[model samples]
Target: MVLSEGEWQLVLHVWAKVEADVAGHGQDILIRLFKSHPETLEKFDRFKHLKTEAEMKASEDLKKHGVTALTALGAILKKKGHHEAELKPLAQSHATKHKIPIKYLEFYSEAIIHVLHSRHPGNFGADAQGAMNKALELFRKDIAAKYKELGY
Candidate 1:
C-alpha cells in the first residue's frame, strides 16, 4: 500500500516505542493475532515474512525504520494536500492484499492494545488503544494519498 510522510512519522514513533519498550512486540501482537484469527495466519505470516526472527523483527524494528519512512512519506503528502480521494482503493487493497477480514482488524487492534498495556502498564492502558487508533488514522491518510497519486 502507498504510504505518506505523516503516517510514516507515526510509524517511526511507534517503532521507537516498540524498540525501547516492545522489542518483542511483534511476536506478541502476532501471537495474539494469529491465535485469534487463525484462518488468516498463513496469509499474514507468509506475506509479512513472519517466519524468520529477523524477518518478523520489523514488527518491532519499526521503531528504527518508521522514522525515516514516515518523514519521507509525510513530506510527500504535504506537497499533495488532502488524500481523501484515494481511500477506497487503498482500503480495498489493504483488505484484500492482507486477506484481512473486517472482524480481524478489530481483533488485531485489540491485540495490539493488549500488547501495549502488557509492555508499559499504567502509563498507557486504555489510552493505548487511542494511540493506536490515531496512528492508524495517520497511516490510513497516507495510504489514501499514495493511491491518489496512482489514481487508484
Candidate 2:
C-alpha cells in the first residue's frame, strides 16, 4: 500500500515528536506488551521476571534497553522505508542469537500502535493508524523475509 504524502507526513510528524521522549515512549511499548502479553517478557533477559508495569518502570536495565531498542526504531522511521540493509542485521540477530520468533515482532508492532494511539488520542485517528500500520507492515515484511533466510 502506497502511503500518500500527507499520510507519510502525519506519521513522521508524530514519530518525530516521539523522538524527544524515547525513554518514556519506549518503556511504554514494552510495559504495554508485558501487560497485554506477559509471556513475551520471558523472551527478554532483563524483563523475564517483571510482569507488572511498576516493576518495568523501576528497573534501570528495562529503561535502558527500552530506550536502546526504541532508538533503533527511530532510526528506521527516520529512514522511511530505506532500511532493509540495516534491518536485516538486527532481524538476523534476533532470530539467531536472541531466538525471538517473528510473532514477537508483531507484538512489538501492536505495542507501538497502542502507545501512539494512547499518547496522541486527539491526533491518532484512522488515517494515522492506517499509515502507521502500513509502515510497520513494510518493516515486518522485510524482517520476516530475513528471518526466513536465516532458516528460522
User: Per-prediction TM-score, please?
Assistant: 0.47, 0.93
TM-score winner: 2
Task: Give a tens-digit lDDT track for model 2, residues 36-124.
Answer: 88778888876787766787899888888889998888788767788877797799889999998888889989999999998887678
Residue 83 C-alpha lDDT in model 2: 89
Candidate 1 vs. true structure, TM-score: 0.47
Give the per-residue lDDT of model 1 (tens digit) for 63-83.
343333334334433433344
Q: What 10-residue stretch in candidate 2 is worst by lDDT?
A: 1-10
Q: Which candidate is the best by lDDT?
A: 2
lDDT of each: 0.52, 0.84
Model 1 lDDT, residue 61, Cα: 45
Q: Which stretches of candidate 1 lie over 4 Å from their true place?
A: 1-16, 21-23, 45-92, 130-152
